[PDB]
Design a protein around this ligand. Structure first.
Ligand SMILES: Nc1nc(F)nc2c1ncn2[C@@H]1O[C@H](CO)[C@@H](O)[C@H]1O
Ligand SMILES: Nc1nc(F)nc2c1ncn2[C@@H]1O[C@H](CO)[C@@H](O)[C@H]1O
Ligand SMILES: Nc1nc(F)nc2c1ncn2[C@@H]1O[C@H](CO)[C@@H](O)[C@H]1O
Ligand SMILES: Nc1nc(F)nc2c1ncn2[C@@H]1O[C@H](CO)[C@@H](O)[C@H]1O
Ligand SMILES: Nc1nc(F)nc2c1ncn2[C@@H]1O[C@H](CO)[C@@H](O)[C@H]1O
Ligand SMILES: Nc1nc(F)nc2c1ncn2[C@@H]1O[C@H](CO)[C@@H](O)[C@H]1O
Lengths: 230, 230, 230, 230, 230, 230
């Protein structure tokens, strides 16, 4: 149906969970979904559709970086009529009070990318997670009573950032963690009147040197439950 | 104590409500606060401190524009040790589904100002309302059962915008309304590890032509109650 | 007549003196104008109209920052058919040869704001004081034989500037002082084929630590006389 | 050894061919390499190392977008001591004289990304293919007598570009085709004193509507032979 | 002494008149100066030094564009200890009320160049003519009773401007004329605590189609006399 | 025929060699061309047309800086129907492995100018030398067996660069040398479907302190021979 998706309208649930690693999406589909069916594997993206507690739910990879997720997200909302996209994955901690294995729920994401300025007449577009999704994720976390930090994330275009002072600058402003897609996902959802959100498990701290499964499983519980609530 | 505030540390409550119009802040202090005392009137800013349901609460004007509120907000957090600043006021509707008299709670604010790029190494800083404040405002609205729209706002540097296409662009991305301070307030709160939020009553629609007291009073109820919850 | 002005066309003189502090404008009106009449007090802006040496002259506040003065100035030229706006006020010295209490007449103003780039297709617009006004102010100063420095000013969006190196950079280029409106005022006057200028009394030096009435009164004499000459 | 590569120094040849699609890299390894061994499959990237005409050669996916390839390329040069990276893949034609199935060899690549400005103090960095690689690709094409167009490419951050006028602008300047990695690859090679180049087969035209295997196989012949020449 | 000047300190007068055309500078030296001596001809720049009414005065070409004049001006202030540089030449009219053959005295100059942003931490630097020079030029014009328009000029990097809407934009803001050096000259003078100014004779109108000697001679009279006054 | 060229269509050969110094172009015409005829001397630009090995060839100055060469190059392609422009001249070495007297052939040129962003919707345009010209220059060098380095150049707007860190940054990325026109020349050739290239002899090193005729003559041999090959 699209240059990056062989599936047809209806093959995807209205709620899709996405992570960068296609093998993680495969794992997620085999571990948490019932009767997972491979609906798209163009570029080995591992797009599946199954059910969770009886409700349709899809999981698919989105690659690394804003340009990548921008391709997948826009096609999902536009062609497959998806309504909600929840980004699930790992991230690097920025804030000194954020530790490895911590779970973070993004209220929004800053970025050093030019994509949003291109879409917003060179002005400041606040890549903001859909309030419904942020609420669904936080309520799920509260109901499951799983500690989670809510706040700003940063989507960098440079995993290996030349601007070494940026890290401390973000710490001063209390950005929670760094990843590479949220800032791109959020504005696309707005344009399509759809919804998006993001939750990550800190797998490393960029300001200093500091089991990882429990944290990842807890994050998945939150995303899945929130998905049902939505 | 500061170039724009004659008050001394302790004269202001840890929670301050702010609006652009100094006469509105005076009105608010005389109408909703008990035993309001003028604590600062440099530049006729009308800074008062009284109590609401027994709790200390201050109200003060902040002028129009990011540069103005940036002066007042930074001094309040830094010198007067204020913890929470809730911006209350009017705004212009952008989204076609947003109507005059509607109450809007900002999740974040975009801007055409250069201030955040100056503070954030020329990158995209998501001027995000503190999640605690957004929640306090929304819960108050739910408890008072007062319809309110939650979403993105836009803080313009140009009330009379030369870029006439921006209005429709923001409508496509579903920005709710336009004002002139939020985008400046939010990042300052982050820097001081403090909190900030914003709630406005739509007093006009910028995309077409379309009582105003009830809406303003309801907005004040929400802000005041949320202030107590915080 | 406008969202920020209750006065009607004709209530304002063709020449208006403006300062940030509304209480200063009130003081100016009661101290230097004959039969001052309050013509506008929306947002407590203190807009008056009286006479000086028999000629009509208005004085009104304009708040702090380019966005604020941009609102007031554009409405004055456009709706109230004002012809000349002379900004009078205080400023911070930059140049090491400029001292506190010195009077400065702006030839132009630089800025770290994005407003002029928005109006000028992202290019460099030289916020220049109207040559007639600069001349009127300088001749008045010469005739009153009051020492005054003529040169570049800087209109910052950030009173509390994070970029601490900017101060010395401006000293190297010999910017005289810093304020927060001139750079916004000047281009608006050009657009309306009207005139604008600015004169300030240095109330503090930003590069080091260093009666204030005489300087302020002398500055007012210059502005008033120049107003008559125009 | 790295967050995205499980292989160890020595597992990769000094010359690596890369394409966005991991399944294409798998296909390439099974079709053109002798004794291909999977050396890295983190995130299903399909990194292989085999031999072509007796010489060591690796093939691996790099995902879509500058941020993605920037991660893989920098790790290859820095950690695995790779010397040459030749990007092989598909692209969209821009120039009206460029047709679908045409083979294009990039001399350089323009971009709407902010990555190079971040690495180059906000100036214009010419993402240029290594002259040795451009020559090796062109000589191979000449020796194999396979028609190929040499010229500028464009690496977009937005596959679905909102700026619809850009396409015709690039046509006027004669950009040959569009892809999403070259502009990111080239500067990284320069920084590591290494080499990089790109060759693509046009799979579609963005300015109008206009077998695909022959073109892809011919492109692979050129890349492989050039790899040997280097 | 410098890469572009063979003269030695002292060969140039403290006041130098400059124009783009080296042949015009030669003409000026032979027509208005007494005992003109060629002091520099590197790159055929035609740098002369003679006397006018007994006072030392130099005339030299400066090429076309900000980068060119920036080279010559900085060397003159820095190495040859020049104090005043008055740019004399031709320009294109912008304002509809400005006609061919009109003489224009620049108060300042806007630009689409990046040079000033590079020198001014990416902010808006107002390329302003030295007030002493502007005054000297205007007084000379008044004393010689030669009609001259005083106002903003624009220094473009593109004589053949692709942005065809800029012309009308500048007309709306009342820029008087266009040339290619002033915006570069002015900031350099500031840095060296020296002085600079510009006066031009409109040789063509860019907004419509509309003897040239008288205008040029009158402009030279103004510059020369002003030079003496300084 | 044009504001900067008195010659008429046909007076210039389809291949023009250009250098900044007009006296160097005169020297080149008298030293390497047979029967050189002055075809244009507006602004003393020294435009000649003669023959080399029986083929028509023109040589003309282009001044210093992108704005200057942009004027001359665009008029040559557009009005005089020139097909190839080869920039010949001197440059400053950047790379530590590049030494004075070395000959450099530009593959492309980076720049700190805003011209290309203005022509390319504020994106990154890779100022790339025409591949035919780069090849002609390199083959000539190989056939004449004259050592020459091929790589990136940088066209600065500031000969006296305030950003002193840029030099080392470019060294890290291996820019070969610095000049002031290439980045402007290349994009203009693309727009006119014509060709351009550049070759320079390093006359100085900007990173340290380190006969000059042989190098200049060898560079001229390469340019001339390449001109014939084209
Ligand atoms: N520390 C980290 N820094 C950045 F920039 N991204 C991180 C980090 N940890 C995980 N990620 C996620 O995995 C990919 C990058 O390895 C990207 O897809 C990103 O979302
Ligand atoms: N329609 C509107 N557009 C903009 F830009 N700001 C609005 C609007 N309505 C109210 N405001 C609030 O009042 C002031 C501007 O009049 C500013 O202080 C701002 O916060
Ligand atoms: N030192 C100073 N720095 C800056 F940025 N602005 C100054 C200063 N002194 C006075 N002002 C004027 O008063 C207000 C800021 O307090 C603004 O309205 C401004 O015009
Ligand atoms: N027409 C096209 N436009 C763009 F922008 N990229 C193209 C096109 N065809 C193929 N590609 C390559 O495949 C991916 C995008 O589908 C990216 O990885 C890119 O390199
Ligand atoms: N109409 C005009 N437009 C521009 F952009 N520059 C003009 C014009 N007329 C004369 N000049 C002066 O001469 C040179 C450009 O031909 C430049 O050196 C410039 O100063
Ligand atoms: N070291 C150098 N740095 C820069 F920026 N340009 C150089 C250098 N050497 C020679 N040039 C060439 O000569 C003129 C500048 O003197 C310009 O025309 C330029 O092309």
């Amino acid at each position: 149906a699209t240059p990056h998706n062989s599936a047809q309208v209806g093959d995807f649930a209205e709620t899709v969970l996405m992570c960068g690693d296609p093998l993680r999406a495969k794992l997620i589909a085999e571990t948490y979904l019932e009767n997972p069916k491979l609906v798209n594997n163009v570029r080995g993206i591992q797009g599946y559709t199954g059910t969770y507690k009886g409700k349709p739910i899809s999981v698919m990879g989105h690659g690394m970086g804003l340009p990548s997720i921008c391709i997948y997200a826009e096609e999902l909302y536009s062609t497959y009529k998806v309504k909600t996209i929840i980004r699930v994955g790992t991230c690097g901690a920025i804030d000194m009070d954020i530790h490895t294995r911590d779970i973070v729920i993004f209220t929004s994401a800053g970025t050093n990318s030019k994509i949003n300025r291109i879409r917003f007449m060179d002005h400041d577009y606040p890549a903001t997670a859909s309030f419904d999704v942020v609420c669904a994720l936080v309520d799920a976390a509260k109901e499951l009573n799983i500690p989670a930090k809510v706040g700003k994330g940063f989507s960098t275009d440079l995993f290996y950032n030349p601007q070494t002072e940026l890290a401390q600058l973000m710490n001063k402003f209390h950005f929670l963690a760094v990843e590479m897609e949220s800032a791109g996902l959020f504005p696309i959802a707005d344009l399509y009147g759809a919804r998006a959100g993001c939750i990550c498990t800190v797998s490393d701290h960029i300001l200093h040197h500091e089991e990882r499964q429990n944290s990842f499983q807890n994050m998945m519980k939150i995303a899945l439950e929130a998905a049902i609530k939505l």
